Amino acid sequence: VVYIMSKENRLIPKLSDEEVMERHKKADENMKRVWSQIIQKYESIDNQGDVIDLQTGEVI
């Protein structure tokens, strides 16, 4: 894992064109996952008015 000097003289990892692209891809997989998690949280009946019977596990 090699490092080189940025134009501001700080050390940054020397990534190939491809590794950089793979980082963009991982950024995207990640923001997709977060987004759907936000949607699932607010969409759930459990934080709309909800009551659950513990015998059945079902929404009353």
């Binding site: 080189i4 940025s6 134009k7 501001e8 700080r10 940054i12 990534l15 064109d17 950089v20 980082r23 963009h24 950024a27 995207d28 990640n30 923001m31 977060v34 987004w35 936000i38 949280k41 607010y42 934080n47």
Partner: protein, 68 residues
């Protein structure tokens, strides 16, 4: 992000389309606004990195933007 200026903005923006906001509605918007921005900042950061900079510029953000 702080809640109060965000809320003031949500209201300014709802007004150009005319309403009241449920509190979970603003929170969900805020959580979503934050993911969106952070995601764009990561892409912007990667463009700077490819140009061998650790300082992100308006031009970097503008490009990450154009790739809608």
């Amino acid at each position: 992000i702080s809640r109060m200026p965000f809320a003031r903005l949500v209201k300014e923006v709802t007004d150009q389309f005319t309403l009241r906001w449920q509190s979970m509605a603003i929170m969900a918007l805020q959580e979503a606004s934050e993911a969106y921005l952070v995601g764009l900042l990561e892409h912007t950061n990667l463009l700077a990195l490819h140009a061998k900079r650790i300082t992100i510029m308006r031009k970097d953000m503008q490009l990450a933007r154009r790739i809608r």
